[PDB]
Design a protein around this nucleic acid. Structure first.
Length: 197
DNA sequence: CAGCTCTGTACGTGAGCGATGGACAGCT
DNA sequence: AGCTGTCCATCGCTCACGTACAGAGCTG
């Protein structure tokens, strides 16, 4: 047997959850799919050694230095970035989640975005915006695209911005370099919004 | 037929764990 | 010289908070 969790069983991790890191007046909220086994283990956001999130945040210039999962609580105050996930339940990957779990997650998520009202709701994963869009805007497009979406969160000025998941599981964007374009465009969108203020 | 949803499957990088074995020092 | 055990460089395998797409099965 291969022990990847310092003697903590996978069964124990599957019952753990990952806390939200949300405040008012945030520029960005990063919305993941659900916690993976490493996030459940660490209790911090994107600790996976191969996950591209922290590398892309630095490569794009959203952080001035390369940060890691232990810095996630400093992001609202220092960078104006918060975190949540569409689904609370921990699983090894996105493929283990049911349709009902996603739609329950969607209803909870739209309520959270209506409370905190960040300038930008960032969907870290195309799959969660496909569900969100059909559930909240009642819109299903044949070719959903990444980047800025044409619908604001209902009863708010919060924009929806979609990126490919920072998980290294997706072969279509094999490296952090292949996803950094979306983080740079996210940065440009943030700077443009703050410019109008 | 044609378009839609649903399901099974295949897919490129890079990182940690466990196994292997060469270098090498200590000791007779 | 011969033995022996540790260190650690390196390899192979598994995995990672998914995604695009064919093709079957509905339905208009």
């Amino acid at each position: 047997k291969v022990d990847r969790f310092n003697g903590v069983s996978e069964a124990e991790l599957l019952t753990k959850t990952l806390p939200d890191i949300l405040t008012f007046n945030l520029d960005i909220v990063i919305i993941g799919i659900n916690p993976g086994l490493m996030a459940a283990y660490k209790g911090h956001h994107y600790p996976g050694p191969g996950n591209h999130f922290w590398k892309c945040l630095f490569m794009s210039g959203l952080s001035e230095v390369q940060l890691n999962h232990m810095d996630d609580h400093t992001l609202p105050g220092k960078y104006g970035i918060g975190f949540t996930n569409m689904v609370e339940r921990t699983t090894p990957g996105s493929k283990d989640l049911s349709s009902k779990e996603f739609r329950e997650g969607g209803r909870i998520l739209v309520q959270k975005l209506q409370k905190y009202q960040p300038r930008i709701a960032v969907f870290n994963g195309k799959c969660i915006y496909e569900i969100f869009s059909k559930e909240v805007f009642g819109v299903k497009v044949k070719n959903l695209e990444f980047g800025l979406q044409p619908h604001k969160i209902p009863d708010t000025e919060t924009l929806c911005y979609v990126m490919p998941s920072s998980s290294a599981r997706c072969a279509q964007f094999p490296r952090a370099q292949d996803k950094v374009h979306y983080y740079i465009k996210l940065k440009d969108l943030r700077d443009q919004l703050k410019g109008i203020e």
